[PDB]
Paper text:
Caspases belong to a highly conserved family of cysteine proteases that have essential roles in programmed cell death, inflammation, differentiation, neuronal development and axon pruning. In addition to being activated by initiator and effector caspases, [name] can be activated by a unique intramolecular self-cleavage mechanism due to its longer intersubunit linker. Excess neuronal active [name] is associated with Alzheimer disease (AD) neuropathology and age-dependent cognitive impairment. By investigating the activity of four rare natural [name] variants ([name]-A34E, [name]-[name], [name]-A109T, and [name]-T182S) and employing X-ray crystallography along with molecular modelling, we have identified a putative allosteric pocket on mature active [name].
Following our previous work, which described rare natural [name]-R65W and [name]-G66R variants with significantly impaired activity, we examined four additional missense rare variants with single amino acid substitutions located remotely from [name] active site: [name]-A34E, [name]-[name], [name]-A109T, and [name]-T182S. To assess the effect of mutations on [name] structure and function, we solved apo mature crystal structures of [name]-[name] and [name]-A109T but crystallisation attempts were not successful for the two other [name] variants. [name]-A34E, [name]-A109T, and [name]-T182S did not show significant changes in kinetic parameters, KM, and kcat, for Ac-VEID-AFC hydrolysis compared with [name]-WT, whereas [name]-[name] displayed slightly reduced kcat and consequently showed ~2-fold reduced catalytic efficiency kcat/KM. These results suggest that [name] rare natural [name] substitution negatively affects [name] activity. In [name]-WT the E35 from the large subunit of one protomer forms a weak salt bridge with R254 from the small subunit of the other protomer (and vice versa), stabilising the dimeric [name] structure. By contrast, in the [name]-[name], the two salt bridges are replaced by two repulsive K35-R254 pairs. In addition, [name] substitution disrupts a salt bridge between E35 from the large subunit and K284 from the small subunit of the same [name]-WT protomer, possibly further destabilising a functional oligomeric state of [name]. The crystal structure of apo [name]-[name] did not reveal hints that could have elucidated a potential mechanism responsible for reduced [name] activity. Although [name] substitution may lead to the disruption of few intersubunit salt bridges within [name] dimer, we did not observe decreased in vitro stability of [name]-[name] compared to [name]-WT or dissociation of enzyme subunits during protein purification recently described for Caspase-9 mutant, which could provide an explanation for the enzyme inactivation. Located more than 30 Å away from either active site of the [name] dimer, the N-terminal loop E35 is found in the neighbourhood of K36, which together with E244 and H287 forms Zn2+-binding exosite next to the postulated allosteric pocket.
Numbering used by the authors:
A (entry chain B): 30 to 163, 199 to 262, 266 to 292
B (entry chain A): 30 to 163, 199 to 262, 267 to 293
Write the structure that this text describes.
Amino acid sequence: MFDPAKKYKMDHRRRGIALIFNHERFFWHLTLPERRGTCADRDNLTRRFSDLGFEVKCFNDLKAEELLLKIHEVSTVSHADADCFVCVFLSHGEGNHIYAYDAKIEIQTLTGLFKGDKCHSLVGKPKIFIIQACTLPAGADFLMCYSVAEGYYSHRETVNGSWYIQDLCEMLGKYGSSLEFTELLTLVNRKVSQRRVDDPSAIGKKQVPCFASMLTKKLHFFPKS
Amino acid sequence: MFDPAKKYKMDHRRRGIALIFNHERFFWHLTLPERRGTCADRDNLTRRFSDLGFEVKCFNDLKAEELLLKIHEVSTVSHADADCFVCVFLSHGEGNHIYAYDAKIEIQTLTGLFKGDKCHSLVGKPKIFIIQACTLPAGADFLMCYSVAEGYYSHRETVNGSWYIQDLCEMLGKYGSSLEFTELLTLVNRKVSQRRVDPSAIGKKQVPCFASMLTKKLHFFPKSN
């Protein structure tokens, strides 16, 4: 009958793809912290998801030609022998209205490609989207992880990256292979929300992340094989 | 150090208020299964939250004068000796545009009254909103539970209530006092998504969702008598 401890099947051959998408186009004056922080976040993510068995692939949206080339690949490639799919969307904080509006269209596109109708090979498999906001995607077995609720405070980028990706990567490296994934995201909620400014204008305010789950089972990333 | 198993402090004198809000006004014609189903949902919820230690209150929005009265009561009353706050928002499925638009403002108002700035006595304590949709609430230590995604299928009310409330109450009764609450909501996601239809709803399934800004594990262990 009903098993409260039922888990997603994570014994397939591969873990799956971990797509790290960098939103760059329509962003012009890029300071030194932003440029070195974005690279720190990507590299930190590439190490934590690779250690969990994912095949990391990193795109950006600067070259429209290469963008469609590599997007078509991940959308049409078969995931039948994969445990799950992960997609991380990275963006800069201080962006214009064109940059911010493009991100929303990109996020809708990405999430839409992996819904049950357009990707049979991921049906019944967790589809995890981690979005660094500058939303309303939904679907069975989706997990949406947001760095901040839209309209609320998020700390500026730093040479070492952003608060959300730093804390998410610390928990992933420390607890990724043991704890249930939503328990892990709850720890990121606490770690990030506890950080404080040393920007005297941002005194007293905090960054509150959020995650929205449509998963039906427990999700673990025990070491494979 | 950092405790990955840290949980909210739930040893206060009282558990807290469990507000059951019935959205009724502007519904143009109420069929028999809808009258009883809504009553079945309210009674089922009152039984389960009472057994978990909550002080249950049930309002509706038929009397405009009496509602602002009671909304003022639950908002301004002290929660300093309470573990948390729960609010269930019940509404009918087949509603007109006025009925649906009114629901959004009611939900936006209700959640707003319990923000940290508006309610000092619930700061750092979980605030749980369970919404039977016909959204964008946020805040630290908020837990939003939706019967359905924003614009997807939801099964219609019956004499015994709605699929979402029935399955929620079944899990609360069996596992409410033991399992972490988000783990319990995940079981609801599976139970509701597995139910099939016996007309024009072939191949459809209702996929619930919950959005967490909680920072700790949430349990409802039996209170100290």
